[PDB]
Design a binder for this molecule. Structure first.
Ligand SMILES: [Zn+2]
Lengths: 157, 753
């Protein structure tokens, strides 16, 4: 500001002119040249990474059915835990632009029915997924599945 | 030596799928401009309905015109002067494309004709009625008129005297012909008519002109077992439209079918051509079977009164896919064949043929005999030749373009003198006309550049006081282009082209001032000022100014401000030239030339007068001498340097006193800068013989406005225009138009030197 108002006034009163560059060059090239001399001489990566960094209790892979190589992918899950029994596969669908959103779980009510243990698992599952917050990931849901199975097994015996 | 110049291909254009084959077209204009279309079928139909415009000097950048056509484009034609393009396809839609703002990278159309549902099979422009004849025997006649002789055909549809009328004629798939004429304004007159009462399939058609203003149309059904009909057409504009009068001409029948040995072969006709447009006395036919083909020629010479006979027929040919005709107008007289045979001069005796292999043949015109065979190591679908026939362009069944070098010798060794005579005779043809010479530069060897330049220099002289007046710019430009190929003389080009500028800036100033009172009658102001300046050899500038009638050199004090940049450039050039004495330099040629120094000498007295009239327009010298007249100091040294060369053949060397006094000059006058205009970017200086070059799309393996001396920033803001040949860059829309030298700006709207 101070000591430089005339330059600001000159620049503002000169701007958006077709010959501004020519004027500036012709008025300021020679002294600068003389004083100093010459001038200077499919599947998104996030899903692949999160699958790579999951606990070896899970071996999730692509669904043999449904579409592929798109923004929305489908995965089928299997649980291999020595301390827990076998449960339905609990497949998932991943929408496009997975970060900053949440995946959804495809419920299969008839699969979990006809057994008190399996429907106890299912009601604990519904409770936990209602307890999960927004913007959650798939690893959190898988861990919730494992913990719900463990809690149901503990409650049974 | 038949050779390959360079192959151009485009990435991602290939790898098409589910694409049926479609015929293509190609067109070569007077300037080195190529207009074509290529089969792409890449994720859009319109890529197969675009017009590709290519410039041979810069093959890498291509222009695409998105034509609004609904079907496959059939034919493309250029005008007599390559300023407009005619395009037609199926379902009518004949369009006339015009150049936009005189830019070759922008096209727009506002004129067209349409017939609904009928594909067009033939299309042509109307004739202007001027042609020339070239005699190789008189190549040393030392007379431009003696070499290239006028033939005097007659023009078609002459109105209001000897000025022809422009338009086009088209023939559809059926027996239907349409004629369109263009008024001097934007008005267009269109008409349609039926050929004859016999309405049938017309698969092939051709159009030719005859002396007297008549059109010959040839129609072929294509069954090889039916006659080829010929009709005569006259066009007359009876006060409101163009009426067409048609009548029948004798027909012919195909050969190679009465041989009674094996006639089942060759069951279809595939090509019907006229041997040369405006030459309707020779017709070429080409029939083909699934495996082999036959090509024949017929004529209508006088022995019924008129009959068609057989001239030649080849032994056996493969499938024919492309045929191309010469464009050079050979005289074809009996006395010229012997002198064109003893000397290896074959620029107009060749017909180019392509087959379904990688083989391209050059066959003799009068008798169908093969003389040149080329193998590519695929087949060629569309191809064209040049006006000088030094090269041919070809499009294969892929995304590749090829340019092939055709030599007049065709492998036969020759001496230097015959080659020089051939090259100069070919260059004089482009000298008389407005055609370019890129294909001629494709063949000039670096070794014999100096001989060509000097011999062309004496060819320029000893003309009848009128050809020299209108060929100065062309004689300068041709040798400026020639001198850049030889590394021995590569440094002299800046001595030529810059010199050209010195005329222009001097030509617009002597005509810019109009005296308000005449003095010294029967003498132009430029001539009187030049003779006054060359009559007085006074050392300083104040004595000379007295006797030039300073009261007359008065302008409107508005164009004077616009001239400031030119005067500053003149002063900077004077300072640089004077400071170049103490030095093979880009400014060496002006030291030994007297006329240029003299003209630059009187160029400054007038600006001294103007500066004393108005001090703001004077060039801004940065001299470290406030009490010394810098421009008078420059004038003294310029006069001293001028007298040493104004003698008729001086052959003198400057004395040491001049050398030291110009040595002391930079201690007082700073040298700001200079810019060299001939930026080396052409492919002529980069190509090598028997070294094919493969270049891709968009690869192309201190910015100043060269027209008006205006400096731009580090990165320019507004878009500009670039010259093709010289390579100069200039602003597109000039900033000052209400107050500018209209005598200087109007000289570059169409073309640059
Ligand atoms: Zn130019």
């Amino acid at each position: 500001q101070y000591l430089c108002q005339p330059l600001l006034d000159a620049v503002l009163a000169n701007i958006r002119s077709p010959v501004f560059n020519h004027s500036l060059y012709r008025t300021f090239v020679p002294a600068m040249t003389a004083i100093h001399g010459p001038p200077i001489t499919s599947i998104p990566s996030v899903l692949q990474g999160e699958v790579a960094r999951l606990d070896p209790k899970f071996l999730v892979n692509l669904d043999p059915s449904h579409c592929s190589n798109n923004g929305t992918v489908h995965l089928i899950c299997k649980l291999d835990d020595k301390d827990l029994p076998s449960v339905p596969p609990l497949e998932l669908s991943v929408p496009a632009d997975y970060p900053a959103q949440s995946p959804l779980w495809i419920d299969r009510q008839w699969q979990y029915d006809a057994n008190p243990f399996l429907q106890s698992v299912h009601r604990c599952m519904t409770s936990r997924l209602l307890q999960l917050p927004d913007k959650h990931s798939v690893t959190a849901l898988l861990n919730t599945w494992a913990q719900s199975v463990h809690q149901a097994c503990l409650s049974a015996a | 030596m038949m050779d390959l110049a360079y192959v151009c291909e485009w990435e991602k254009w290939s790898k098409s799928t589910h694409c049926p084959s479609v015929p293509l077209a190609c067109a070569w204009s007077c300037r080195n401009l190529i207009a074509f279309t290529m089969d792409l079928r890449s994720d859009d139909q319109d890529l197969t309905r675009m017009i590709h415009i290519l410039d041979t000097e810069h093959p890498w950048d291509l222009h695409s015109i998105p034509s609004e056509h609904h079907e496959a484009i059939t034919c493309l034609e250029w005008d007599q002067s390559g300023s407009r393009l005619l395009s037609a396809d199926a379902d009518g839609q004949i369009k006339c494309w015009s150049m936009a703002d005189h830019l070759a990278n922008s096209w727009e159309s506002s004129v067209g004709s349409l017939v609904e549902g009928d594909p067009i099979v033939a299309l042509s422009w109307l004739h202007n009625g001027v042609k020339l004849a070239l005699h190789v025997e008189k190549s040393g006649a030392s007379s431009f008129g003696e070499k290239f002789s006028r033939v005097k055909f007659s023009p078609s549809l002459t109105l209001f005297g000897g000025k022809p009328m422009e338009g086009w004629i088209a023939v559809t798939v059926s027996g239907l012909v349409t004629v369109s004429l263009l008024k001097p304004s934007g008005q267009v007159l269109t008409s349609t008519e039926s050929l004859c009462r016999l309405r049938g399939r017309v698969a092939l058609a051709d159009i030719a002109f005859t002396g007297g203003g008549n059109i010959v149309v040839a129609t072929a059904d294509g069954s090889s077992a039916s006659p080829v009909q010929f009709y005569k057409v006259c066009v007359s504009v009876v006060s409101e439209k163009c009426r067409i009068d048609t009548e029948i001409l004798p027909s012919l029948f195909m050969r190679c079918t009465t041989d009674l040995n094996r006639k089942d072969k060759f069951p279809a006709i595939t090509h019907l051509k006229f041997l040369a447009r405006d030459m309707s006395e020779q017709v070429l036919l080409c029939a083909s079977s699934q495996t082999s083909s036959i090509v024949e020629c017929w004529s209508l010479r006088k022995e019924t009164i008129l009959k068609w006979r057989i001239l030649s027929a080849t032994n056996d040919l493969d499938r024919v896919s492309a045929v191309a005709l010469p464009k050079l107008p050979i005289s074809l007289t009996n006395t010229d064949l012997k002198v064109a045979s003893d000397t290896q001069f074959y620029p107009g005796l060749g017909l180019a043929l392509a087959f379904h292999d990688g083989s391209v043949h050059i066959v003799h015109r009068l008798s169908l005999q093969t003389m040149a065979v080329f193998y590519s190591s695929v087949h060629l679908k569309a191809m064209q030749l040049s006006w000088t026939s030094l090269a041919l362009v070809g499009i294969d069944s892929h995304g590749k373009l090829s340019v092939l070098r055709l030599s007049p010798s065709m492998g036969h060794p020759l001496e230097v003198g015959l080659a020089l005579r051939h090259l100069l005779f070919l260059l004089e043809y482009c000298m008389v006309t407005g055609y370019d010479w890129w294909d001629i530069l494709l063949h000039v060897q670096p070794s014999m550049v100096q001989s060509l330049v000097e011999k062309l220099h004496e060819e320029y002289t000893r003309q009848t006081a009128a050809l020299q007046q209108v060929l100065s710019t062309r004689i300068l430009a041709m040798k400026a282009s020639l001198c850049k190929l030889s590394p021995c003389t590569v440094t002299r080009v800046c001595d030529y082209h810059t010199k050209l500028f010195l005329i222009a800036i001097s030509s617009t100033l002597k005509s810019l001032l109009r005296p308000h009172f005449l003095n010294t009658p029967d003498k132009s102001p430029g001539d009187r000022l030049t003779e006054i300046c060359t009559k007085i050899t006074d050392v300083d500038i104040d004595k000379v100014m007295i006797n030039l009638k300073t009261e007359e050199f008065v302008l409107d004090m508005n164009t004077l401000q616009a001239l400031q940049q030119l005067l500053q450039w003149v002063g900077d050039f004077v300072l640089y030239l004077l400071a170049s004495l103490p030095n093979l330099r880009p400014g060496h040629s002006f030291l030994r030339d007297g006329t240029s120094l003299g003209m630059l000498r009187e160029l400054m007295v007038v600006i001294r007068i103007w500066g004393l009239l108005k001090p703001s327009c004077l060039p801004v010298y940065t001299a470290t001498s406030d009490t010394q007249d810098s421009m008078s100091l420059l004038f003294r040294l310029l006069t001293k340097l001028w007298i040493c060369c104004r003698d008729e053949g001086p052959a003198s060397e400057p004395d040491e006193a001049l050398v030291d006094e110009c040595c002391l000059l930079p201690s007082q006058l700073l040298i700001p800068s200079l810019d060299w205009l001939p930026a080396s970017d052409g492919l002529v200086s980069r190509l090598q013989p028997k070294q094919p070059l493969r270049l891709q799309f968009g690869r192309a393996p201190p910015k100043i406005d060269h027209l008006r001396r205006l400096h731009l920033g580090a990165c320019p803001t507004e878009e500009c225009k670039a010259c093709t040949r010289c390579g100069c860059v200039t602003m597109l829309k000039s900033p000052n138009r209400t107050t500018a030298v209209k005598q200087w700006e109007q000289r570059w709207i169409k073309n640059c030197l």
